[PDB]
Design a protein around this ligand. Sequence first.
Ligand SMILES: CC(C)=CCC/C(C)=C/CC/C(C)=C/CC/C(C)=C/CSP(=O)(O)OP(=O)(O)O
Ligand SMILES: CC(C)=CCC/C(C)=C/CC/C(C)=C/CC/C(C)=C\CSP(=O)(O)OP(=O)(O)O
Ligand SMILES: [Mg+2]
Length: 284
Amino acid sequence: MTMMDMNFKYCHKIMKKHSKSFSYAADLLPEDQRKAVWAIYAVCRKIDDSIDVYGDIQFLNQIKEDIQSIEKYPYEYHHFQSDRRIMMALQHVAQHKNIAFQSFYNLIDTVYKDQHFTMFETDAELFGYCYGVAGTVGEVLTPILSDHETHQTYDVARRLGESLQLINILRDVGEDFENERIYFSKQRLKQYEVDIAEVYQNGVNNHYIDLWEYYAAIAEKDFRDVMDQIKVFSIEAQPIIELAARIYIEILDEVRQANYTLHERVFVEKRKKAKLFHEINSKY
Ligand SMILES: CC(C)=CCC/C(C)=C/CC/C(C)=C/CC/C(C)=C/CSP(=O)(O)OP(=O)(O)O
Ligand SMILES: CC(C)=CCC/C(C)=C/CC/C(C)=C/CC/C(C)=C\CSP(=O)(O)OP(=O)(O)O
Ligand SMILES: [Mg+2]
């Protein structure tokens, strides 16, 4: 195992640790796509965790600075300030695929702003945050998952990412409230007669379901439109992308089965993941 193999193995472990949902999916990819996804995931995990988990703002500027170094001087040796093993992997990727650095910067800005957190007044603000935190990961992942880096491909990847974040939000309502976040819209909450602090304390009411279901329909419709345009990805990536997406669509059915609980984080079991993949691969 070489120096660089070790760097990507560290990234793998980070994703194995943090992505209960998607680690299983990514490791189905061919060796070179797989390794790139690990590195990107690890860069993204480190970004999201910098403040929220490590409570470390300087580590976030350090991550930005490391990425900036890679963008300007992809072939030099850098004394990376944040996590050396990840940044070296990311640099390795960037020598072989072209990376939309601006997408890492958008994610960084969103993560920064997600401290002075202010409830979205409008859904358009909520969707803007879905772009910031997930659409950009979609964009960053595009050259790894497709040989066609055209607008259609960036577009489908961006929309897929954005729809997964919405399901994410739909899974995490109660947990986010515990950490003092409501991602549902002030407008949409005022419309549906819903206060999250109240259904947390008293239990799921019919107003809440209507509202939750309003949003799940947005995410299910966008998922379906992504699926129709899946041939935009490479042939080996398609079944996996479809897996990762059908896993999240399964999350919604779990929330539904748990009567929309706000007091427990639902999940898809590993065994049900393989069932899904078996079903998907039949088409392929
Ligand atoms: C190719 C393929 C199959 C997919 C790979 C997936 C991939 C590389 C994407 C990584 C993107 C990552 C890490 C996320 C960055 C920002 C974000 C959405 C954080 C937390 S969401 P949650 O609400 O879950 O909270 P908690 O922060 O606790 O995780
Ligand atoms: C997915 C793919 C390969 C195809 C195209 C590109 C694409 C859509 C990538 C999406 C990856 C992102 C940021 C979208 C959703 C992931 C998400 C909602 C947040 C944290 S992932 P965690 O690790 O927190 O997962 P859990 O909390 O669910 O366990
Ligand atoms: Mg976090």
